[model samples]
Target chain A: DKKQALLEAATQAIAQSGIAASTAVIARNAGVAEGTLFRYFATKDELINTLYLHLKQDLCQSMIMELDRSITDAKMMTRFIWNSYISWGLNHPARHRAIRQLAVSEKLTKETEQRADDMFPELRDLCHRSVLMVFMSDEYRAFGDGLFLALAETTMDFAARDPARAGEYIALGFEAMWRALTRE
Target chain B: DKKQALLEAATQAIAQSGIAASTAVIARNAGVAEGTLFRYFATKDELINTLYLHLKQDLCQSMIMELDRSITDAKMMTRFIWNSYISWGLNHPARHRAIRQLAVSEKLTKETEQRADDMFPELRDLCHRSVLMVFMSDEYRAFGDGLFLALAETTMDFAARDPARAGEYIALGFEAMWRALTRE
Candidate 1:
């Protein structure tokens, strides 16, 4: 329970500030002492690194399960991942921001990133065969993922007021992504 | 000269830290006294808001000049904007991040944002008439803009290593955007 509390608190803190946000603030927010946080996480870097892996894994885990069940066609898979991606952002704003920051920063190790990517072989392999296949570097993929998630998040937020319009955005947004990947 | 220096320092500071990054930190980075910062901008909010408007206007200014000559067709126009958008981000990472944070935060006043919009009425009208027209809300447009910029920036980074394939991304990225906007 304390570990989960620390992670939640750390997510919120890092989201609000950057990783430089103090351990004291996170511990306080989690309703624990500073030492308690250290007990849960050996160091500030460790805490942040752990949180990065946790958020990435959490995101991949959610998407993978849904994706595994619905891998019927390219279009369907795109729609499934796109919808799931946006839903995760809207539902977990703090976690999403924290993860974005961590992903771009030097905090996330190559080993952790590779491990997270390995969790979703189906998604990774599919991307490899897409337009992104041409520029298949880790940096490029991460940036593309960020771009798509931003679009999906925006679509969801705009669609929240009008469910019908939301449907339109999903179709249009996915088409845009598909074209981006395969237009060449 | 000092004001510009301060703004540059502020951009880097805010990008590295969050908006909560202190005025003193900004001043130190700029190699100016804390009081000197107030001499130019009466308040921290004023400093940030001005920086936001400046960055947005700077972007529109660069884009508008190119757009004027290249307003040949819908596809050409989209390509121009997409290419310009990505180029700005790639060349000015610090400014991009600062503007992004200001945009998402409550710090940037509506008046300033509206003024920024007015600075590029033609481009604004063009987007409004296109795919963004389908969802005529600022929130959705902002999100779409972020997504597109992210993709463009990533594409540029990836293509940097393979100068030969750079043109392909421009064509392919726009196709994706065009398809997304016009897919009926």
Candidate 2:
């Protein structure tokens, strides 16, 4: 519980001041002795890496918490997941911002970043299987992949960068994806 | 001619080192004194803003080259522009990477980023109109904006980060967008 508290404190510190702040500032803000900070995380980079790993895992847990067990179709599943993901981010803007900053921070270790992303195995598999389930011919699938990449590049770019107006673009993208996969 | 050389040198430097690289590095690579670099531009941010302005204009020009007179329909125009944008990125991978990096880099001023984006008004308006033209009532537009945001977010994320294998995802995203707009 203490370790968890320390982690949360560190996350709050970085979320507030970004990565450029000093360790002393962080410790003072956390109301912990400076020495205690180092005891938990030997270096700031290590601390950030740890924070990144745990946050991604926590977010993933929260994301899947309400996944509808009744939904059998992959397209419907995707719609539910995308809506949930966006809504969760909207609700937890602060935590989401912190995690995003940590995701791209230089303080993160390669293994830590990889581990954070590793939590999404099921999502990845679902995406691949969604492709497999599409009614299109192989040629269409090939075309579909290219089109998917084009749509994906634009959609995710705007969503992460501009939360206020992200919903419209996201919906259009998903609608297209649904049709491409479902087209007979 | 001087401006042209400066633009070319800046593009090359950005391609090689990204927007965050020092002016000295850019100057050295451009075979000019650091002072000379400043002589052409008041600040690093100015140079970046100018580069963005220039690049987008150049890309627009490239897209309209050869001007197939028959490809005048809205769908055909959108498709052409879509592929042209991607092809332009493919052709100038380094410069494209550099521009994209600078677009989101801290080194560039937010004002400049906004200004740079404003330079593409025609293109943005074209995209907005094309999407709007396909849809029905004003009520539909409100709901559709959220969907468009989703697609835009997903698509750009794929393009900016994962250009290599982003094709399938882009296709799915576009198909989704088309369906939402056409309600097909």
Candidate 3:
């Protein structure tokens, strides 16, 4: 309970002020004894990595459930994943933002990487790629560049408040991506 | 010349320790008095905002030159931009990394936002109407999101010592993006 509370408080702090706020700031904001923070987390980096891993795990688990049996259909799966992301992020804004911040940071150390890796073996296997393989490795690799751009654009294009409009942008973005992936 | 040297030294300090390094540290690293540093920039935040504006301006200029003739062709443009990015980053990895870290932080205040905003109006406008522009709203906002994901993945994906494979994967990633946009 104590550790959970600390983690919850840290998440709240991160959510409120963004991740750049120091641990001391977080502890002060949480009303917890500063030394007690060290007991739970070895350092701020460890706390960030822990927070990132757990939050990503939560999101992946939530989003994965929405994938269903139709994920084998890439277009349908793309739309489904898009909706899942919207729902999950809206449902947990602070957590969503927090995870995003940490996801790009150098703070995501080896332990966090390993833990997050082990937790999502199935999902990771889906994108199992080797740097050595490049585009020459597989047919999918040929489409790799286009998929990444679509992923970036589609995920970005849907940040609005209106669901219908957001959906339209998402569809358009994905359509653009689909077009890029398949021969015209 | 002196002021430019101070600014360059400050950027170097940020490159080494991220934005967390203090104004005093910057001065010490630059071999200038703390009071002299304050004379050049009103505050630490002022210096940072200035640095961001300058760096973003550099990025915009590079992108323009890099994508000059291929504006209408998304495939060629993407390939050129991706390779140019690798070359640019390879040349200035530290400053590039530093600028990235600061740009996403909450410290980007209203004035800083305005300053950074001033860096690239034409480029942002062009990006919005491009075939790759899948996101909603002004192109700048969409570009930020897409670019953030691209750069994050690029940083992780391009750990190669060989320029050829690095160039190939980067090209492939963009091709994948082009396919995603132009296909089905």
| TM-score, every prediction | 0.65, 0.51, 0.55
Clash number for model 1? 1
Cα lDDT tens digits, model 2, B97-141, are: 566656545465657645654755554555566654523344344
Report, to 2 decimal places, the DockQ of model 1: 0.31
Ranking by TM-score: 1, 3, 2
Comparing to the true complex, what docking class would candidate 1 get? Answer: acceptable
**Ranking by lDDT, best first?**
1, 2, 3
CA deviation > 4 Å runs, candidate 1: A64-71, A156-171, A182-184, B1-56, B64-143, B149-184
Model 3 lDDT tens row, A1-184? 6677777777777765556757887776667777988888888887898888778788789877777764676456655765676567667776766765566445677778678767655444544522224432443342344344335333443544335556555555545444433442
Per-prediction TM-score of chain B? 0.80, 0.62, 0.74
Global lDDT of model 2: 0.63
Residue lDDT tens for model 3, B5-38: 6677777877666678688877877778889988
**Clashes per candidate (backbone, < 3 Å):** 1, 62, 16
- Most accurate candidate by DockQ: 1
Compare candidates 1 and 3 on lDDT and give the better one. 1
Choose 1 or 2, whichever is better by DockQ.
Answer: 1
